[PDB]
Design an enzyme around this catalytic site. Sequence first.
Site, PDB file in Angstrom:
ATOM      1  N   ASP A 140     -24.335  44.711  66.691  1.00 38.98           N
ATOM      2  CA  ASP A 140     -23.034  44.603  67.364  1.00 38.98           C
ATOM      3  C   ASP A 140     -21.994  45.557  66.737  1.00 38.98           C
ATOM      4  O   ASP A 140     -22.214  46.769  66.779  1.00 38.98           O
ATOM      5  CB  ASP A 140     -22.567  43.136  67.463  1.00 38.98           C
ATOM      6  CG  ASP A 140     -21.356  42.927  68.340  1.00 38.98           C
ATOM      7  OD1 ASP A 140     -21.489  43.062  69.568  1.00 38.98           O
ATOM      8  OD2 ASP A 140     -20.268  42.651  67.791  1.00 38.98           O
ATOM      9  N   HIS A 172     -28.135  38.676  73.373  1.00 40.89           N
ATOM     10  CA  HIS A 172     -27.225  39.379  72.466  1.00 40.89           C
ATOM     11  C   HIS A 172     -27.461  39.061  70.988  1.00 40.89           C
ATOM     12  O   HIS A 172     -27.391  39.960  70.152  1.00 40.89           O
ATOM     13  CB  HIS A 172     -25.760  39.127  72.849  1.00 40.89           C
ATOM     14  CG  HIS A 172     -24.792  39.792  71.923  1.00 40.89           C
ATOM     15  ND1 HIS A 172     -24.626  41.165  71.923  1.00 40.89           N
ATOM     16  CD2 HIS A 172     -24.003  39.255  70.967  1.00 40.89           C
ATOM     17  CE1 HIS A 172     -23.735  41.417  70.980  1.00 40.89           C
ATOM     18  NE2 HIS A 172     -23.328  40.298  70.380  1.00 40.89           N
ATOM     19  N   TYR A 213     -11.841  45.109  67.197  1.00 44.38           N
ATOM     20  CA  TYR A 213     -11.669  45.496  68.604  1.00 44.38           C
ATOM     21  C   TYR A 213     -10.342  46.212  68.874  1.00 44.38           C
ATOM     22  O   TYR A 213     -10.233  46.940  69.864  1.00 44.38           O
ATOM     23  CB  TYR A 213     -11.691  44.242  69.498  1.00 44.38           C
ATOM     24  CG  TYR A 213     -13.029  43.551  69.610  1.00 44.38           C
ATOM     25  CD1 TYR A 213     -13.394  42.547  68.718  1.00 44.38           C
ATOM     26  CD2 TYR A 213     -13.900  43.842  70.655  1.00 44.38           C
ATOM     27  CE1 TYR A 213     -14.613  41.882  68.836  1.00 44.38           C
ATOM     28  CE2 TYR A 213     -15.119  43.182  70.787  1.00 44.38           C
ATOM     29  CZ  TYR A 213     -15.470  42.201  69.875  1.00 44.38           C
ATOM     30  OH  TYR A 213     -16.677  41.561  69.990  1.00 44.38           O
TER      31      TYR A 213
HETATM   32  C1  LIG Z   1     -19.141  46.148  70.186  1.00 44.37           C
HETATM   33  C2  LIG Z   1     -18.848  45.292  71.376  1.00 44.37           C
HETATM   34  N1  LIG Z   1     -19.729  44.101  71.379  1.00 44.37           N
HETATM   35  C3  LIG Z   1     -19.244  42.809  71.683  1.00 44.37           C
HETATM   36  O1  LIG Z   1     -18.064  42.600  71.970  1.00 44.37           O
HETATM   37  N2  LIG Z   1     -20.224  41.776  71.641  1.00 44.37           N
HETATM   38  C4  LIG Z   1     -19.985  40.384  71.907  1.00 44.37           C
HETATM   39  C5  LIG Z   1     -19.033  39.677  71.166  1.00 44.37           C
HETATM   40  C6  LIG Z   1     -18.804  38.288  71.406  1.00 44.37           C
HETATM   41  C7  LIG Z   1     -19.545  37.601  72.344  1.00 44.37           C
HETATM   42  C8  LIG Z   1     -20.559  38.276  73.100  1.00 44.37           C
HETATM   43  C9  LIG Z   1     -21.332  37.543  74.067  1.00 44.37           C
HETATM   44  C10 LIG Z   1     -22.305  38.182  74.811  1.00 44.37           C
HETATM   45  C11 LIG Z   1     -22.565  39.575  74.607  1.00 44.37           C
HETATM   46  C12 LIG Z   1     -21.830  40.313  73.688  1.00 44.37           C
HETATM   47  C13 LIG Z   1     -20.807  39.682  72.891  1.00 44.37           C
END
Ligand SMILES: CCNC(=O)Nc1cccc2ccccc12
Lengths: 318, 318
Positions: free
Chosen positions: B106, B295, B237
């Site tokens: 991630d 995920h 983010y």
């Molecule tokens: C780099 C960006 N990646 C994300 O934001 N991943 C995620 C963060 C939180 C919950 C999720 C739930 C499903 C899929 C991806 C998720």
Amino acid sequence: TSCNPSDMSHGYVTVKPRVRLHFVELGSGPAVCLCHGFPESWYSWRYQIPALAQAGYRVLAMDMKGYGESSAPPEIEEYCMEVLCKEMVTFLDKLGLSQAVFIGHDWGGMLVWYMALFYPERVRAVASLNTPFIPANPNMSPLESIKANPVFDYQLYFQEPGVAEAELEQNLSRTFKSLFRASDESVLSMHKVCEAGGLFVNSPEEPSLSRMVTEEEIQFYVQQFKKSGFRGPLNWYRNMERNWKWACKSLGRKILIPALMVTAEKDFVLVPQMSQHMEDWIPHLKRGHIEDCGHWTQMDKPTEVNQILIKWLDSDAR
Amino acid sequence: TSCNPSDMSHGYVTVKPRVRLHFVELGSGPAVCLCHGFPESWYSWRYQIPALAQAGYRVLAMDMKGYGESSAPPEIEEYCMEVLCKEMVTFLDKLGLSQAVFIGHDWGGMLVWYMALFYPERVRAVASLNTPFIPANPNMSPLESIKANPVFDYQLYFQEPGVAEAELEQNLSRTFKSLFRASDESVLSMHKVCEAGGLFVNSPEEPSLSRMVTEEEIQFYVQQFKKSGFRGPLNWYRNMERNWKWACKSLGRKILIPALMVTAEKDFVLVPQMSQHMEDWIPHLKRGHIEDCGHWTQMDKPTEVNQILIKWLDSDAR
Ligand SMILES: CCNC(=O)Nc1cccc2ccccc12
Ligand SMILES: CCNC(=O)Nc1cccc2ccccc12
């Protein structure tokens, strides 16, 4: 090159619910576990840590049980060689280390010999500074052995709990300044301690700073010893009966792993003569000798210690 | 085989005054740095840590900046790719590690790609779970790319400080039970999150426990997130323009070190198709693909993750 405590990687391993062991970590490659003596710290290896890591080794400089950030239970039984070695094996298990090179000094040196004796499957190679390996005699008592040589007078003074604790804790700055000195700068009379009243009897109230250590270095030992005191460190001496009984259980078996015995010319307690006939019980025994070197081997001659340790590690441990 | 927090070796590295990085350590051999995603912990690698250590590797499972025992400053700028990557370089310096194989997932996966991009000399080999490597376009705006894709609507909700924090911190037990689910068990719709005014709308107040996690595992994440909350994790983010500007400084350069791209069939956010044409920018790119994997890659298919990582580490990283 030395170590800055704020710039080091600090590790913590809970070996028992009551016992958590602290250590500093530097470098990659084979695991090298450094074990200090009394009344020391992981900081006593400050010159060895960057040198061994630069040489190509994973350095794990220990804060022994009862020292600094490591747990210090008040019980005397918690400081016998049997439980101390057991915890060091658990330390390797929880870190996922099958084997490690064990290097010790003073009380740490005694620990590394028993780690090599009782757990050869967990010790890749063994090195000791000043402390020799003498197999325990079942026909001889541990109390009368200390009484035989007059240089081990302070050992009997260290037996009674509270007596040495109050003198060593009285003034920490005076304690380390009087202890951490070169043999020519030393004023401590190890031959007679019990009759004198204490260890810093001939030492002045405000002793001069030794050439080996700075004011900043002395104050680090002061701050570390404020956490638990001297009870834990002194308890290492209070297990003569337990250590003798445990050592007599090995009787016959030898240390077959590669060994290194480093003697200090100016150490008047752990004399180089005490290391004689060690090769009779240790087949793969190697030797090293440092001139003009007192008891505080790592601080006294850091360059000489680094040279001997690196040479032996690359040729006998690798 | 999983990890028990009380039996793990806990390491701490102060990379900056106010910034201390926590990690768990297991095994001997080449340094393997594991970097978790959002909203995770070192515990997300619980099945990988004993597997990689058994394979002959020194595992360093990180608690990323803003998570668990690691420092969590409230500043948004403290969580941009530039400062996060530089801290990881300092982390290797203080531990005395010249090189380490970086495996990420991630946001950790995004960090590992930029570690390989800007610091290839410090990254022995690079592996990423679900997160692809897309070179930054200097003509395209960061907000324009996210708004164009309907799947990245939740990222816009994560922008305003305090808004997403209040929802994720409202009920931590509900938060991790709703998030840590297999794709077929998922109760969250990542599309139209801003329209619903929250992530947990379709999700029940008392959600059922997923087949991947136990109640004990869920409670660990709850206790870990009670320390600093969601401000630090969400700030990863909030650096779109800063991360884009820094990435544009690399422009045209290829990742020449060994690389692994592991895609998850059922990850609907970081889709396997997003990893297309990655070999054009990474000449020595190796691939991995896990079927029936959502995920939460390490959690969903631990056996598959272990098989792919070990096979690649033995052939490319070593
Ligand atoms: C780099 C960006 N990646 C994300 O934001 N991943 C995620 C963060 C939180 C919950 C999720 C739930 C499903 C899929 C991806 C998720
Ligand atoms: C294993 C037994 N070794 C010791 O007791 N070593 C020592 C401890 C404290 C001060 C000292 C001063 C000079 C020499 C040795 C000293």
